[PDB]
Amino acid sequence: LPQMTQQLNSDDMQEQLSATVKFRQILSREHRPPIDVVIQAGVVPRLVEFMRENQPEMLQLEAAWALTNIASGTSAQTKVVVDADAVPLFIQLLYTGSVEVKEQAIWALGNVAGDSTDYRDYVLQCNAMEPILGLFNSNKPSLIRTATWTLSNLCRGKKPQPDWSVVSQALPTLAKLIYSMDTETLVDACWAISYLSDGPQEAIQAVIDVRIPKRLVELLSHESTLVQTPALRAVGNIVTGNDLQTQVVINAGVLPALRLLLSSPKENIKKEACWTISNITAGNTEQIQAVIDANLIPPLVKLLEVAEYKTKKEACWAISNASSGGLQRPDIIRYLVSQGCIKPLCDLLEIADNRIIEVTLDALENILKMGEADKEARGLNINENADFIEKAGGMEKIFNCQQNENDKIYEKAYKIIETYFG
Amino acid sequence: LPQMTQQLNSDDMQEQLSATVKFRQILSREHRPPIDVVIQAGVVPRLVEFMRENQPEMLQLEAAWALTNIASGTSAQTKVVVDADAVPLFIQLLYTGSVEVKEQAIWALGNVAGDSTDYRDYVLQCNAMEPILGLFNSNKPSLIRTATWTLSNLCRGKKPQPDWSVVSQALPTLAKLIYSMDTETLVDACWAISYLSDGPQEAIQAVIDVRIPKRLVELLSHESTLVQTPALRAVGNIVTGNDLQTQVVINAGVLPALRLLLSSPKENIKKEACWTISNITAGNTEQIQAVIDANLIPPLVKLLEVAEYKTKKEACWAISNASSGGLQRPDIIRYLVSQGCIKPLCDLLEIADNRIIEVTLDALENILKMGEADKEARGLNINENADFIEKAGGMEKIFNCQQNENDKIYEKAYKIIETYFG
Ligand SMILES: [Co+2]
Ligand SMILES: [Co+2]
Numbered sequence: 001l002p003q004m005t006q007q008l009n010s011d012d013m014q015e016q017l018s019a020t021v022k023f024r025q026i027l028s029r030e031h032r033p034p035i036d037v038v039i040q041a042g043v044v045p046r047l048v049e050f051m052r053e054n055q056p057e058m059l060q061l062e063a064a065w066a067l068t069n070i071a072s073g074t075s076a077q078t079k080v081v082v083d084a085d086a087v088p089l090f091i092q093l094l095y096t097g098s099v100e101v102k103e104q105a106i107w108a109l110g111n112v113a114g115d116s117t118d119y120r121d122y123v124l125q126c127n128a129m130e131p132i133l134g135l136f137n138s139n140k141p142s143l144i145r146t147a148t149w150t151l152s153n154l155c156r157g158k159k160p161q162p163d164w165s166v167v168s169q170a171l172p173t174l175a176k177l178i179y180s181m182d183t184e185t186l187v188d189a190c191w192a193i194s195y196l197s198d199g200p201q202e203a204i205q206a207v208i209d210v211r212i213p214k215r216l217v218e219l220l221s222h223e224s225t226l227v228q229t230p231a232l233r234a235v236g237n238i239v240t241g242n243d244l245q246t247q248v249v250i251n252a253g254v255l256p257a258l259r260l261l262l263s264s265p266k267e268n269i270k271k272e273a274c275w276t277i278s279n280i281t282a283g284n285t286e287q288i289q290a291v292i293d294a295n296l297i298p299p300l301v302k303l304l305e306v307a308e309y310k311t312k313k314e315a316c317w318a319i320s321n322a323s324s325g326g327l328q329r330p331d332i333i334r335y336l337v338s339q340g341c342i343k344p345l346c347d348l349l350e351i352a353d354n355r356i357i358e359v360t361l362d363a364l365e366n367i368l369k370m371g372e373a374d375k376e377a378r379g380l381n382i383n384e385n386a387d388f389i390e391k392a393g394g395m396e397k398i399f400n401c402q403q404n405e406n407d408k409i410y411e412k413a414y415k416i417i418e419t420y421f422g
Numbered sequence: 423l424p425q426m427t428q429q430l431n432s433d434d435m436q437e438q439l440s441a442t443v444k445f446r447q448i449l450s451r452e453h454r455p456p457i458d459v460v461i462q463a464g465v466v467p468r469l470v471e472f473m474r475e476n477q478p479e480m481l482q483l484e485a486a487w488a489l490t491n492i493a494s495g496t497s498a499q500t501k502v503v504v505d506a507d508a509v510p511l512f513i514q515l516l517y518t519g520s521v522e523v524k525e526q527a528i529w530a531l532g533n534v535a536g537d538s539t540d541y542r543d544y545v546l547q548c549n550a551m552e553p554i555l556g557l558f559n560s561n562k563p564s565l566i567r568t569a570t571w572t573l574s575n576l577c578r579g580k581k582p583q584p585d586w587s588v589v590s591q592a593l594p595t596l597a598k599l600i601y602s603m604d605t606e607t608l609v610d611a612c613w614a615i616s617y618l619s620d621g622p623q624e625a626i627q628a629v630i631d632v633r634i635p636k637r638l639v640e641l642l643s644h645e646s647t648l649v650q651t652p653a654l655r656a657v658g659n660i661v662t663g664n665d666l667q668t669q670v671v672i673n674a675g676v677l678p679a680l681r682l683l684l685s686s687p688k689e690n691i692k693k694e695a696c697w698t699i700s701n702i703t704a705g706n707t708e709q710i711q712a713v714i715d716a717n718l719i720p721p722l723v724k725l726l727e728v729a730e731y732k733t734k735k736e737a738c739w740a741i742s743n744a745s746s747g748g749l750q751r752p753d754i755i756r757y758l759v760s761q762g763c764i765k766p767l768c769d770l771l772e773i774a775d776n777r778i779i780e781v782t783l784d785a786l787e788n789i790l791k792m793g794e795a796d797k798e799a800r801g802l803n804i805n806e807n808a809d810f811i812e813k814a815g816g817m818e819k820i821f822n823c824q825q826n827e828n829d830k831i832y833e834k835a836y837k838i839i840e841t842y843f844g
Contacts, residue, residue, distance in 0.1 A: 074844075075840070157829060159829050233827070267772075308773050309731045309773060310774070310775060351730050351731060351732060353732065353775075403651070405655070407580055407581050411538075415497075418496060422496075
């Protein structure tokens with residue numbers, strides 16, 4: 001190392017190149033590259049020098065390669081490279097460099113961007129977006145992957161949400177990347193899109209205008225859960241928007257697609273599928289009816305019954321939001337009850353957290369108001385739904401809620417028992 | 423009714439009495455007392471007239487009785503009585519009335535008070551507390567029961583919390599009632615105390631000052647779970663207070679008692695027991711060491727693995743809080759690991775909601791930091807805990823968390839994987 005460090009500091013171009021190649025090779029070890037000793041040798045800032053505008057490209061590639069092996073190490077190791085002010089140089093190399101040079105720069109920039117939110121912003125402010133977006137006009141798959149990966153690292157994060165004026169510039173490229181033949185590329189593009197869709201209406205509408213929604217919906221039935229997961233996450237973030245934005249996703253045909261995801265052997269997919277659906281049933285009466293017409297209630301009721309809690313929780317919201325539209329269209333409630341949602345709802349009370357008990361009690365109450373409403377509409381002397389709940393053992397569970405510490409809950413419980421089971 | 427209404431409005435005493443008796447009788451029907459028909463009759467204000475100070479006591483009783491049957495009906499019916507100015511007369515009857523009159527008055531007041539926080543405050547504001555506490559100097563079980571139940575309704579409610587200057591006057595009486603032989607009385611007294619115990623530091627301190635804690639602890643081993651629940655709830659509320667207030671409960675011997683409750687056939691007792699413990703391990707080092715010395719970790723680790731989620735969740739907090747104390751005394755962490763908390767903690771990650779995942783990742787990161795420090799203090803070239811976690815399958819689960827939408831979680835995950843599994 002002392003010997004190499006010498007060559008590197010030599011003024012002989014040929015000797016500098018000889019040294020950088022060496023530092024690049026040791027930093028390329030698959031085992032445990034002596035990154036820390038290299039940093040301890042103080043040759044980082046020198047290697048950074050070799051990436052300057054007028055250095056020979058071979059020297060630039062070797063130096064960037066070496067620095068990239070370092071920047072892709074631990075966070076500490078990344079800080080060193082960043083502090084040597086390598087980022088601005090990696091970025092100009094994105095414009096100038098050969099494919100090989102570009103592959104190192106984009107990788108290194110991706111690691112800096114994915115290190116933390118402050119580095120994410122640093123990179124964005126160094127204006128990496130322009131040169132990064134130009135990489136997609138190339139035809140090398142591997143280079144496009146890294147680039148897409150780095151792009152997702154720039155879009156990710158919600159405490160400091162990334163500078164939207166900058167990151168939104170990626171939407172057009174992203175809209176094309178989700179048609180990629182490369183699976184890894186597809187995956188990261190969908191993750192990036194989900195990150196951009198994890199924001200206000202402005203963000204969501206932006207994703208809608210570049211016509212990404214329909215492609216996202218087609219990707220829900222991709223053979224791989226690695227593609228399905230981020231695609232669903234993105235769809236889920238989009239339907240969190242307003243009713244108009246959600247209808248866009250619905251006209252793209254997301255409902256029939258969701259029907260398949262509810263059967264996914266992947267628990268988190270069933271979970272986010274129920275989550276997505278609950279943000280659609282949280283919409284207007286016509287959107288709730290659409291969920292009904294797509295035959296999404298039956299599988300939902302089933303999950304409410306057998307899935308893990310984290311999924312049941314989601315199924316409940318979906319069903320409870322659906323029952324909210326029952327005040328208007330009473331037949332929605334009638335349909336929910338027909339699909340056997342009462343038993344699952346009652347049982348849930350026994351294992352749910354307080355927020356879910358509130359949600360579940362809302363659904364049960366809406367169900368009771370309905371059964372009460374057409375009980376009067378007829379000369380009947382019984383509230384069928386109330387009777388339904390009693391049989392399912394729900395009465396006893398609602399009674400038990402009277403001892404819950406939460407005011408909203410126990411008060412909701414007393415009112416229910418008193419009103420329908422007195 | 424038309425005839426009774428007439429007699430009721432008569433100036434003839436013997437007539438008013440006879441008619442009040444008849445209204446009382448029909449409003450006493452076990453079946454479905456015609457309360458609404460009686461209200462429609464418009465005689466409520468008239469009956470209220472009959473409870474005034476100058477009225478013959480028999481008329482006072484029959485009128486109060488009649489109105490109490492109405493007041494103990496639906497909220498809407500209770501409202502009719504409250505709006506007729508009955509409350510202040512029920513209260514003055516609580517002083518002057520015979521035992522029979524008092525029994526009606528206290529049942530009416532309890533129903534008004536339990537209706538809502540508005541009626542609760544109105545009742546407290548009408549100075550009902552003075553004659554109510556005065557009923558405890560009586561020697562009739564049934565009366566003391568209803569009186570205790572009423573006191574419970576008056577102390578309940580946390581959104582508007584009840585006027586502390588008023589409800590706190592019940593502590594001395596409450597401190598004595600928890601030594602009662604009557605189960606119902608004891609139950610209600612314990613509930614009333616748990617409600618008083620859910621306030622700020624002052625409320626908790628007043629409960630400690632009148633020396634209720636030790637009795638609460640003794641009651642944790644009461645044969646009936648109807649007594650243990652509210653007693654455990656009250657104890658739980660007290661330990662949410664500061665470290666000093668928490669030591670009072672510890673010195674009362676709560677730990678051995680909780681150890682027993684961790685095997686309660688009641689899921690919610692196991693749950694609040696874990697919750698109670700978690701609020702003790704959230705204290706200083708000595709308090710965490712006390713939990714350890716009482717042998718609470720093993721049963722805690724067992725629940726973390728096999729209990730319902732709502733309980734596991736509580737066990738996780740208890741164990742996780744304990745590990746935070748590991749920084750100071752590294753042997754706390756070593757002990758936790760020795761009791762096999764790692765495996766159940768990793769598995770929890772697969773089914774936990776985001777807040778619990780965060781709690782779990784902190785526990786795991788503390789354990790992991792400990793295994794790292796010792797590997798250093800020793801020449802070991804392995805982080806035993808990291809290896810335990812990897813063996814348990816928690817490595818992959820932690821890895822998966824990197825795709826969680828929550829920033830604090832995925833950052834935590836990437837940080838862990840990079841730092842201990844690289
Ligand atoms: Co990194
Ligand atoms: Co009531």
